[PDB]
């Protein structure tokens, strides 16, 4: 199927004393594989999946070099942004950046992304063609002009179409045992009587990977959204994901209700019924 590599960076200024707290994480699809945390002792980019440990000393030295440089860029950015927005030296502020690439089933470039936020709001982002910028306000417009003059988009595009996909492909092969495995949801239904008139049916999907999934209810073969509750997909903590959807039904009418499950790891959609 399709795959992605994404990196996420968060810097939080610490007014009063010292440099920002900087945390970088790298993912292939829904699997974290590297991290850097400025508060940690190593001051190295660190492995977070077994298949990246195959990489040698030169890899780790390079990633560390680059990620430390990254933290310094964000440190500078925080000062600049405070000036752009005429904010005091007193408050804590946040910069976030995410970038990455998607490949399709052919493992060839589909899409690239590079976006930046200040204090949780859109600041500047590369457009889909990787040739120009979306700037949210006049501060970001000044950044846009700067980055245009410096031909930033060109160099970013080169990485996103080149290095990004090349290394994603590498990781997919090296981590094939888990990265290329689909774990179909393990499903079951529960029942709880709220009173002698009303019952709750809950349809569970557990232990699935990747995280993308759809769970829906039908009543007599037609979609049912009224009287339903669907929780956000959540990490199990072992690399897999969990989700449930519930419906309130008249006690005794459970048989009308069916749960429907769609996931990459299922050849055809699943249908569950109460028994």
């Amino acid at each position: 199927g399709s795959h992605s590599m994404r990196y996420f960076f968060t810097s939080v200024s610490r007014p009063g004393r010292g440099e920002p707290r900087f945390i970088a994480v790298g993912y292939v699809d829904d699997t974290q594989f590297v991290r850097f945390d400025s508060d940690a002792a190593s001051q190295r980019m660190e492995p977070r999946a077994p298949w990246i440990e195959q990489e040698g000393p030169e890899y780790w030295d390079g990633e560390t070099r680059k990620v430390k440089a990254h933290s310094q860029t964000h440190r500078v950015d925080l000062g600049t942004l405070r000036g752009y927005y005429n904010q005091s030296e007193a408050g804590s502020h946040t910069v976030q950046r995410m970038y990455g690439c998607d490949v399709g089933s052919d493992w060839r470039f589909l899409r690239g992304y590079h976006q930046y936020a200040y204090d949780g709001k859109d600041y500047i982002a590369l457009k889909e063609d990787l040739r120009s910028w979306t700037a949210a306000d006049m501060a970001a417009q000044t950044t846009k002009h700067k980055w245009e003059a410096a031909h930033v988009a060109e160099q970013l595009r080169a990485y996103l179409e080149g290095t990004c996909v090349e290394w994603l492909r590498r990781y997919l092969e090296n981590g094939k045992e888990t990265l290329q495995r689909t774990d179909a949801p393990k499903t079951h239904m529960t029942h709880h009587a709220v009173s002698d008139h009303e019952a709750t049916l809950r349809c569970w999907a557990l232990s699935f990977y990747p995280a993308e999934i759809t769970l829906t209810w039908q009543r007599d073969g037609e979609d049912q959204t009224q009287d339903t509750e669907l929780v956000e997909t959540r990490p199990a903590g072992d690399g897999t994901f969990q989700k449930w959807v519930a419906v309130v039904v008249p006690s005794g009418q459970e048989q009308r209700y069916t749960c429907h499950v769609q996931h990459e790891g299922l050849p055809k959609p699943l249908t569950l019924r109460w028994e």
Binding site: K66, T73, E166
Partner: peptide
């Protein structure tokens, strides 16, 4: 593999 070139805003 993270991007090896940087620019400030």
């Amino acid at each position: 593999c993270i991007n090896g070139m940087c620019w400030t805003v």
